[PDB]
Amino acid sequence: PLDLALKRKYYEEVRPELIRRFGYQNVWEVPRLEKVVINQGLGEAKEDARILEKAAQELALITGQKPAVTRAKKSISNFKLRKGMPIGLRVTLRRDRMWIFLEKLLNVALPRIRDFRGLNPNSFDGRGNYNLGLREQLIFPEITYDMVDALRGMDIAVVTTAETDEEARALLELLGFPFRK
Amino acid sequence: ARIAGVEIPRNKRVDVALTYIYGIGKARAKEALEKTGINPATRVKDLTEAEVVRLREYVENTWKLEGELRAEVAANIKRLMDIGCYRGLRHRRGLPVRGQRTRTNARTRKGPRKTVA
Amino acid sequence: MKEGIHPKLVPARIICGCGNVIETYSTKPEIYVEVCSKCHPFYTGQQRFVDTEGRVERFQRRYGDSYRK
RNA sequence: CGCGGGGUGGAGCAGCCUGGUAGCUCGUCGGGCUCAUAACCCGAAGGUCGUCGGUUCAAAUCCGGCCCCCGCAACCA
RNA sequence: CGCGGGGUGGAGCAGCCUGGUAGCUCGUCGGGCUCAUAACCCGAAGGUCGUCGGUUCAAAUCCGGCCCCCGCAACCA
RNA sequence: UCCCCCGUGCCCAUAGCGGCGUGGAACCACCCGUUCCCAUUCCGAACACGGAAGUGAAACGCGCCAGCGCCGAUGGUACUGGGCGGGCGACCGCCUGGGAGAGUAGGUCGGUGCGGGGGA
RNA sequence: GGUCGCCUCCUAAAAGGUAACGGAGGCGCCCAAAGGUCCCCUCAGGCGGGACGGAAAUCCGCCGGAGAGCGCAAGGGUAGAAGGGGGCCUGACUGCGAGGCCUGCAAGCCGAGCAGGGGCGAAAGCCGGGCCUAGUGAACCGGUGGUCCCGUGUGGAAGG
RNA sequence: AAUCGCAAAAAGGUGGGCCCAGUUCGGAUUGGGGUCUGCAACCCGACCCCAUGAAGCCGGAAUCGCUAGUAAUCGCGGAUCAGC
Ligand SMILES: CN(CC[C@H](N)CC(=O)N[C@H]1C=C[C@H](n2ccc(N)nc2=O)O[C@@H]1C(=O)O)C(=N)N
Ligand SMILES: [Mg+2]
Ligand SMILES: [Mg+2]
Ligand SMILES: [Mg+2]
Ligand SMILES: [Mg+2]
Ligand SMILES: [Mg+2]
Ligand SMILES: [Mg+2]
Ligand SMILES: [Mg+2]
Ligand SMILES: [Mg+2]
Ligand SMILES: [Mg+2]
Ligand SMILES: [Mg+2]
Ligand SMILES: [Mg+2]
Ligand SMILES: [Mg+2]
Ligand SMILES: [Mg+2]
Ligand SMILES: [Mg+2]
Ligand SMILES: [Mg+2]
Ligand SMILES: [Mg+2]
Ligand SMILES: [Mg+2]
Ligand SMILES: [Mg+2]
Ligand SMILES: [Mg+2]
Ligand SMILES: [Mg+2]
Ligand SMILES: [Mg+2]
Ligand SMILES: [Mg+2]
Ligand SMILES: [Mg+2]
Ligand SMILES: [Mg+2]
Ligand SMILES: [Mg+2]
Ligand SMILES: [Mg+2]
Ligand SMILES: [Mg+2]
Ligand SMILES: [Mg+2]
Ligand SMILES: [Mg+2]
Ligand SMILES: [Mg+2]
Ligand SMILES: [Mg+2]
Ligand SMILES: [Mg+2]
Ligand SMILES: [Mg+2]
Ligand SMILES: [Mg+2]
Ligand SMILES: [Mg+2]
Ligand SMILES: [Mg+2]
Ligand SMILES: [Mg+2]
Ligand SMILES: [Mg+2]
Ligand SMILES: [Mg+2]
Ligand SMILES: [Mg+2]
Ligand SMILES: [Mg+2]
Ligand SMILES: [Mg+2]
Ligand SMILES: [Mg+2]
Ligand SMILES: [Mg+2]
Ligand SMILES: [Mg+2]
Ligand SMILES: [Mg+2]
Ligand SMILES: [Mg+2]
Ligand SMILES: [Mg+2]
Ligand SMILES: [Mg+2]
Ligand SMILES: [Mg+2]
Ligand SMILES: [Mg+2]
Ligand SMILES: [Mg+2]
Ligand SMILES: [Mg+2]
Ligand SMILES: [Mg+2]
Ligand SMILES: [Mg+2]
Ligand SMILES: [Mg+2]
Ligand SMILES: [Mg+2]
Ligand SMILES: [Mg+2]
Ligand SMILES: [Mg+2]
Ligand SMILES: [Mg+2]
Ligand SMILES: [Mg+2]
Ligand SMILES: [Mg+2]
Ligand SMILES: [Mg+2]
Ligand SMILES: [Zn+2]
């Protein structure tokens, strides 16, 4: 709905340096970010933690959306889990909550991670787009020591029109992402 | 979460709360009271909201800490392996590398007394 | 939008860095930092920190070449 | 082969019925007392449970094939 | 199904015909003693007194009975 | 009546998998937005709605190839209803009628009926 | 010794049916949601992808027609749902039943449609329990609740 | 060498600071960086600086010394010896 600092960043700076490399013969063939699916993917909320909520409202006040409880695919023995047990926290940041979130990761949250050292670049899938994992949560700007209780890393997935892995590299690299080498 | 790798203790002194970082002691804490002139020892929260920030900077780029210093002390010993030295072979074993006495004690190198028949 | 349950994030000033209030509408009214997108090893600069070229290893200890060929 | 019961730390026994649940005794290794050994006092160590499939979310436990311990039979008029 | 009684600390039970105390040995910790495993001994954590709804001035001893174990009885086309 | 298009029926993959192309004035789609109706175990993704700036990239459409899948004969045979003889047997032979499965040659990148909206 | 009723499959010779102390398995339950409807949705698996996190917890990607699932045995069927989720619900109706399936009898089984009165749906329509095929017991004797039909001259009652 | 030297005796007195926490208790362990001896410091020393900041919240069964300036608790000192 809105207009923000990375949304225009992707606008007049990124679209050209992309037609730079691959020289797209059409307005749309050019990459662009669609979905952003954050995944705390608990399982720490087994047959116990009803307090999975005070860890997922934190997920709300850092993503802006309520996260939807993903349950069990089936029942699992050594994992201590029954088909139906809550074990996931999926929030799909789509459209203009994506840019509002993605910039706040890159400019403020990404650097505040302890001993930052690039981004693992092989972790690109190939057939399409990209995603890679965390370690914590309070590194995110919205919180600190007393507000955050238990520690909880989280997964984060990009879904772009990057048909090819190479052109994905460029899209994110230019968009503000620091890589390992 | 605070400074500079992880959050130093609020409600704690601005001479004491120093050593807690992976890289500082009461020895190096004198940079505070003497190389930026900081409070005698009045608390971390107690500090002036701009004096708080002036301390953030002057010890990050002045020394080495946390993840680098952990690795600095760590990656250094990998060298000792790749040559095959008496200090890098006894670390390769996890035994008192700094050469002492390994009959009685030598526990901290060894873990709990394993005990055997 | 589902009406209610989502935190009403109004445009909030992210007062970070050394001269950048990285504005974008966060649900947290104001923010701070001590390590940011500004000052950073991989964000710009060589970043020697205070770690030079591997402490001193090994011929940088000087007091060498006692022998004169 | 016919039925019946059994197989679990080294020895001997619980545990199965009602699945997720491994205990009792001895002994064994470590330590104490003692001149010393036992006694006794202080600690710990030790079984994927016959064997295989398999049911279930998952098997000492439920199920079936085979190996084995033991108990009655295989009536020969 | 119908008559008999309670379902009390973790494991047993006296409180109880006549309500007043949020009950005693075993078990368990610490303690004096023991050479010890022991009896003795001083202090202790344990009741939502099966629950629910009552009778009052509160109930665990008085009720409607939920409950579902022990007990007896009789019937089973 | 010929053609393209949209909405659709029908034969049952010769239709399909894939790669190669081309189609936007039309019509279809993506696309614009969240105000309204409506809407998400989160998200206007989807369903919804108000639109018409962009486009034919995606999807879909018409087409091209035969790598895949698919369909696939003729000939002969196995088998067999019926009628005979043959071997100790396990089984074998002849007559008459019927006659496959595989495999071979080859075919296939669809074929159409109803209405509507364009072209002449 | 084993067996005895029921269901699945095979034997069973391409209709139905068919024996043997033939070969293999299950049933004597379950579900106020696992049911009715309306809306909506789509598997197993494999490869790459990713903090804890795994051969397999959850999130992302491309390939998948059905090998998943459908309470539990097996066969048939089945995603153009019969399977997964949500809203309202209670047709897991009362009175019937044209016509058949099976069949020695008796039982078993399918059901359009009509009437009352409701459920969901905008409506067309769908609901007389569950993807079907097991989850069972004739008659006698009695219990309980109703109805108020008989009630030993007669009004009741007893009994039925 | 009752000259001068090792020599500030430490517990103590006095001011301050902590604030019931594996902590300012605790100093094990370790990485690089230095001084001193002695040819010499890998095995192998001792001191020094940075940093690291471990077991330990008082000890199972058992067990030891000591009856008065003694137990307990403090520092100093020689001999061995280049150093330790
Ligand atoms: C030992 N007896 C004999 C009973 C008879 N009247 C006589 C006799 O010999 N009967 C026997 C006849 C054969 C019978 N038998 C044996 C084997 C077999 N396979 N089938 C049989 O019938 O078993 C009988 C048996 O011994 O009791 C008695 N105590 N009565
Ligand atoms: Mg190009
Ligand atoms: Mg790193
Ligand atoms: Mg050097
Ligand atoms: Mg047996
Ligand atoms: Mg044995
Ligand atoms: Mg026993
Ligand atoms: Mg068994
Ligand atoms: Mg067990
Ligand atoms: Mg004792
Ligand atoms: Mg067995
Ligand atoms: Mg015999
Ligand atoms: Mg009694
Ligand atoms: Mg009274
Ligand atoms: Mg003694
Ligand atoms: Mg009797
Ligand atoms: Mg009875
Ligand atoms: Mg159509
Ligand atoms: Mg094209
Ligand atoms: Mg145009
Ligand atoms: Mg193209
Ligand atoms: Mg296509
Ligand atoms: Mg055409
Ligand atoms: Mg045509
Ligand atoms: Mg044509
Ligand atoms: Mg054509
Ligand atoms: Mg050709
Ligand atoms: Mg061809
Ligand atoms: Mg060809
Ligand atoms: Mg063929
Ligand atoms: Mg014949
Ligand atoms: Mg013949
Ligand atoms: Mg023929
Ligand atoms: Mg013939
Ligand atoms: Mg025309
Ligand atoms: Mg015209
Ligand atoms: Mg018999
Ligand atoms: Mg017939
Ligand atoms: Mg028969
Ligand atoms: Mg594979
Ligand atoms: Mg993987
Ligand atoms: Mg990973
Ligand atoms: Mg990994
Ligand atoms: Mg995985
Ligand atoms: Mg099944
Ligand atoms: Mg079959
Ligand atoms: Mg089949
Ligand atoms: Mg449904
Ligand atoms: Mg459901
Ligand atoms: Mg409605
Ligand atoms: Mg009839
Ligand atoms: Mg009839
Ligand atoms: Mg009907
Ligand atoms: Mg109707
Ligand atoms: Mg059924
Ligand atoms: Mg009666
Ligand atoms: Mg009458
Ligand atoms: Mg009268
Ligand atoms: Mg009557
Ligand atoms: Mg003081
Ligand atoms: Mg204390
Ligand atoms: Mg501890
Ligand atoms: Mg003891
Ligand atoms: Mg003592
Ligand atoms: Zn900045």
Is residue B60 domain-shared with residue B76, that is, in the same domain?
no
- Classify residue A117 by its DSSP letter: -
Alpha carbon distance A171, A60 (integer Å): 27
- Residue B107 three-state SS: coil
Statement to judge: residues B34 and B14 lie in one domain: yes
Looking at the fold, whether B58 and B76 belong to one and the same domain comes out as no
A-interface mutation test, from C15, C16, C28, most A Cβ less than 10 A away: C28
Indicate whether B109 and B60 sit together in one domain: no
Experimental technique? X-ray
Documented resolution in Å: 3.4
CB of B44 within 7 Å of some strand H atom: no
Could you tell me the end-to-end alpha-carbon distance of chain B, in angstroms, rounded to an integer? 49
List CB contacts of B35: < 8 A, sequence separation 6 or more: B58
Environment class of residue A69 by beta-carbon count within 10 Å: exposed (0-12), middle (13-18) or buried (19+)?
Answer: middle
Chain F: positions less than 7 Å from a protein CB are 33-34, 39-45, 54-57
| Distance from C-alpha of A64 to C-alpha of A100, rounded to nearest angstrom | 9
What are the angstrom distances between the C-alpha of B17 and each of A145, A149, B9, B12, B48? 16, 22, 6, 6, 16
Distance from CA of B62 to the nearest CA of A (A): 17
CATH code for the domain in which residue B110 is found: 4.10.910.10
Q: Which of B76, B31, C17 is nearest to A112 (CA)?
A: C17
Query: Could you give the CA distance from residue B43 to residue A13 in angstroms, rounded to a whole number?
Result: 47
Element (H, E) at A138: none
d(CA A35, CA A95): 7
Residues of B in contact with C51 (CB under 8 A): 64, 68, 72
Q: Are B11 and B46 in a shared domain?
A: yes
Q: Do both B80 and B53 map to the same domain?
A: no
Do A106 and A131 meet the contact criterion of CB atoms below 8 Å apart? Answer: no
Report CA-CA distances (Å) from B68 to B5, B26, B59, C39, C41.
10, 21, 14, 16, 12
The rounded distance, in Å, linking the Cα atoms of A116 and C16 is 18
Smallest CA–CA distance, residue C68 to chain B, in Å, is: 28
B36 in the same domain as B51 = yes
CATH code, domain carrying B54: 1.10.8.50
Shared-domain flag, residues B102 and B65: no
Domain carrying residue B13: 1-71
Kindly report the CA angle at C22 between C16 and C28, in degrees rounded to 5? 80
Q: With a 7 Å cutoff on the CB, does A159 touch strand G?
A: yes
- Cα of A4 vs centre of ligand 27, distance in Å, is 55
Please write down the HEC assignment for all residues of chain C.
Answer: CCCCCCCCCCCCEECECCCECCCCCCCCCEECCCCCCCCCCCCCCCCCCCCCCCCCCCHHHCCCCCCCC
Residues B5 and B23 in one domain: yes
B47 sits in which H/E element: none
Selecting from A114, A138, A144 the residue whose C-beta is nearest the C-beta of B66 gives A114
Distance of CA C37 to the CA centre of its chain: 6
Are residues B91 and B43 part of one domain?
no
Helix residue ranges, H only, B10-100: 30-35, 51-60, 66-83, 86-93
Residue A47, number of CB atoms within 10 A of its CB: 9
**What's at A19, amino acid-wise?**
I
Domain count, chain B: 2
Q: C50, B63: Cβ pair inside 8 Å? A: yes
Residues B49 and B82 placed together within one structural domain of the fold: no
Q: Which two tokens stand for residue B7?
A: 């959050």
Residues B39, B27 within the same domain: yes
DSSP result, A33-87? EEEEEEE----SSSSS-STTSTTTHHHHTTTSSPPEEE--SS-BTTTTB-TT---
Q: Which of B71, B93, B108 is the last residue of a domain?
A: B71
Domain end marker among B51, B71, B91: B71
Tell me, rounded to whole angstroms, the distance of Cα A78 from its chain centroid: 29
**Burial letters for A8-29: b for 16+ Cβ neighbours within 10 Å, e otherwise?**
ebbeeebbeebeeeeeeeeeee
Q: Check: CB of residue A153 under 8 Å from CB of residue A134.
A: yes
- Answer yes or no: do A107 and C31 touch at CB < 8 A: no
